[PDB]
Design a protein around this ligand. Structure first.
Ligand SMILES: Nc1nc2c(ncn2[C@@H]2O[C@H](COP(=O)(O)OP(=O)(O)NP(=O)(O)O)[C@@H](O)[C@H]2O)c(=O)[nH]1
Ligand SMILES: [Mg+2]
Lengths: 276, 180
């Protein structure tokens, strides 16, 4: 499946950020090695220190290429009725969440480019008496202030540029609608006081079920129908992820305050909602 | 020391003018006596200029004539250019008006230029000045450097030494000040 293609690479995302934060570098060993070129004993300590760091930098770069390939593979499936387009929006939010941290840590860490530059500077020296083509791409990767954002933006623009028949809106709509719903969740009006972190998450669950029930009543086909925009099966699963004590009020509300739940057309898998 | 303004700064100039050394001397406060050519390299440093934080992205380029087709791929989205020539090498000093100004303008015509004079410590050295005599040559003096900067339309002419670090800090500070 190419729908959990981005989720498969994100498995190691926590490990990448954890390794990137712990990346102290080897600026001290590199510096003293340059200060005393002739000291071969000190050149070994510097070179020996660099190997570990480069291997992690290659591990970080290769991750961005897999994440790039996974994102384009995800956008590729867009092309090919009953389009599950939440995958696009869900995985966009997930990789962007990771992307902001990766860029933030790299941004404020000049040791990364320092180490790398030394590494390829001492390869040449060693040329006198990793893959070379890969190293050049890696050099250009870490040269940027925001490598991941640059990689994502380039990858998405590469997709739309070689899919000109599809308008920019198709792919950029999810990105603009997500920012408006977030504002709805996070924005606090004048009439009431600001919600807590517990209330905003609670609120978010209520509106989700709230708009579904109101949509079910006003929209002809409803929220339960096979040819619906709601995709409830997924919305109920999110509710049953939550503690049983929490969301019982919302869970019940769907059971008896809907319109097209009990009608014949509704799936019997959706009806699987009991309580004791 | 958190995140700052991302300012890209590409350094161009011939081989052995001191492009790589003045970047390594600035960021790491170390001077490599060993000479190894660099096709392309990059460094960075979080610095404070005029009370504003800056993540100064430094792009080191090749000086050799064999990397003319490969050098200009690092040019796009440049905020400032450092055309570096050695003060102890007239050839390099003319290559400024002959090649670099044409080249950097050709790709990025609206991006500022900072004309930098490298190896300032060698201009007043018997050993180094006798060899210029030997090769029938007179070191590029300040008036010449400034006159050249005025011709190419560089916003500032600076002269510094990567070894002594005399006016090394001022070059990058002025490089940032041009993009604020
Ligand atoms: N005395 C002195 N030597 C310097 C100075 N700056 C650089 N050098 C010397 O210049 C040589 C290397 O210059 P470098 O910075 O590598 O030149 P480059 O601009 O990188 N040339 P390339 O395009 O080939 O990479 C070394 O011998 C180094 O010690 C300086 O200010 N003073
Ligand atoms: Mg160099």
């Amino acid at each position: 499946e190419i729908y959990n293609q981005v989720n498969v690479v994100l498995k190691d995302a926590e490990g990448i950020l954890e390794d990137l934060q712990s990346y102290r570098g080897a600026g001290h060993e590199i510096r003293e090695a340059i200060q005393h070129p002739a000291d071969e004993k000190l050149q070994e300590k510097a070179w020996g220190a660099v190997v570990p760091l480069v291997g992690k930098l290659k591990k970080f770069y290769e991750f961005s290429q897999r994440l790039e390939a996974a994102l384009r593979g995800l956008l590729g499936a867009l092309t090919s009725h009953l389009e599950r387009e939440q995958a696009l929006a869900k995985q966009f939010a997930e990789i962007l969440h990771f992307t902001l941290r990766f860029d933030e840590l790299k941004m404020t860490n000049p040791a990364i480019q320092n180490d790398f530059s030394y590494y390829r500077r001492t390869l040449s020296r060693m040329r006198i008496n990793v893959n070379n083509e890969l190293a050049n791409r890696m050099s250009l990767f870490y040269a940027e202030a925001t490598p991941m954002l640059k990689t994502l933006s380039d990858a998405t623009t590469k997709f739309v540029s070689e899919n000109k028949n599809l308008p920019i809106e198709n792919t950029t709509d999810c990105l603009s609608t997500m920012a408006s719903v977030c504002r709805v969740m996070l924005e606090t009006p004048e009439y009431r006081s600001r919600f807590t972190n517990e209330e905003t998450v609670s609120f978010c669950l209520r509106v989700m079920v709230g708009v579904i029930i109101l949509y079910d009543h006003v929209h002809p086909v409803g929220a339960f129908a096979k040819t619906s925009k709601i995709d409830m099966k997924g919305c109920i699963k999110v509710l049953k992820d939550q503690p049983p004590n929490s969301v019982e009020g919302l869970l019940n509300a769907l059971r008896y305050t809907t319109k097209h739940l009990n009608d014949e057309t509704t799936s019997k898998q959706i009806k699987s909602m009991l309580q004791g | 020391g958190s995140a700052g303004q991302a300012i890209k700064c590409v350094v161009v100039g011939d081989g052995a003018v001191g492009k790589t050394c003045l970047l390594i001397s600035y960021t790491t406060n170390a001077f490599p006596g060993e000479y190894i050519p660099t096709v392309f390299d990059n460094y960075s440093a979080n610095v404070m200029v005029d009370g504003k934080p800056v993540n100064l992205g430094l792009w080191d380029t090749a000086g050799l004539e064999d990397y003319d087709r490969l050098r200009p791929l690092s040019y796009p989205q440049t905020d400032v250019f450092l055309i570096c020539f050695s003060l102890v090498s007239p050839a390099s000093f003319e290559n400024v008006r002959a090649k670099w100004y044409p080249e950097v303008r050709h790709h990025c015509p609206n991006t500022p230029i900072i004309l930098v004079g490298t190896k300032l410590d060698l201009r007043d050295d018997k050993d180094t000045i006798e060899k210029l005599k030997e090769k029938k040559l007179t070191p590029i003096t300040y008036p010449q450097g400034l006159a050249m900067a005025k011709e190419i339309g560089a916003v500032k002419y600076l002269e510094c030494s990567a070894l002594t670090q005399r006016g090394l800090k001022t070059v990058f500070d002025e490089a940032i000040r041009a993009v604020l």
